[PDB]
Symmetry: C2
Subunit: 125 residues, 2 copies
């Protein structure tokens, strides 16, 4: 990772997995003031849709969508990026809510990894 | 509330507030088998959008969208209904995540109340 000091605006739920990925790429996280780069999360979407019906839903499709803009000292660089993760959710006998929550968690980590990955390739691009 | 025995398919996170509203309307919740009516949640969407910017987000717009279909003994009755709740999220010094979660909770209750309300008026409509 090049130009390694970052500040994350928004995406509270994505903040920790992102930070983790960033340090894993040799970058660092700082306050807005002491940071060269800023990753602004403009939107986070969690959509749960009925998938396999069979008037009795058997499975759900979960879609996590994140939109972010990279900024350098107040100025936008590159186009706004979108990233989305998809997973099928099927329960077995558990914790129906505790399970869906774990999936969203796995997904948020997935999205973080994809965002940081794309950051690692932004300069070249 | 008329035709008062209901079964809810899906919308796990909305299940309790809905049940509560339903009993508050004199209806009852039962298994698929022992229930006249079925309320099938086809989609639940939670979108968090950047609202007031000011490269430093100050406020977020939260939108909860729910889509459900009412069914009578396997057959669809009425059009699919959509309900959406909107709230502005602004933190103060807290628990940034604990607060957003409380808002989504307040909203889910709001949505439940609107769904049950519309159920109370479906026959007439």
């Amino acid at each position: 990772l090049t130009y390694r000091s970052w500040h994350i605006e928004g995406g509270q739920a994505l903040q920790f997995p992102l930070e983790t990925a960033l340090y894993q790429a040799s970058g660092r996280v700082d306050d807005a003031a002491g940071a060269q780069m800023t990753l602004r999360i403009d939107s986070v979407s969690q959509n749960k849709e009925t998938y396999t019906v069979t008037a009795v839903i058997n499975e759900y499709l979960l879609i996590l969508t994140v939109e972010a803009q990279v900024l350098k000292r107040g100025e936008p660089v590159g186009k706004p990026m979108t990233v989305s993760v998809r997973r099928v959710l099927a329960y077995a006998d558990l914790g129906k809510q505790e399970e869906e929550a774990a999936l969203w968690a796995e997904m948020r980590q997935d999205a973080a990894e994809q965002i940081v990955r794309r950051l690692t390739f932004l300069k070249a691009e």
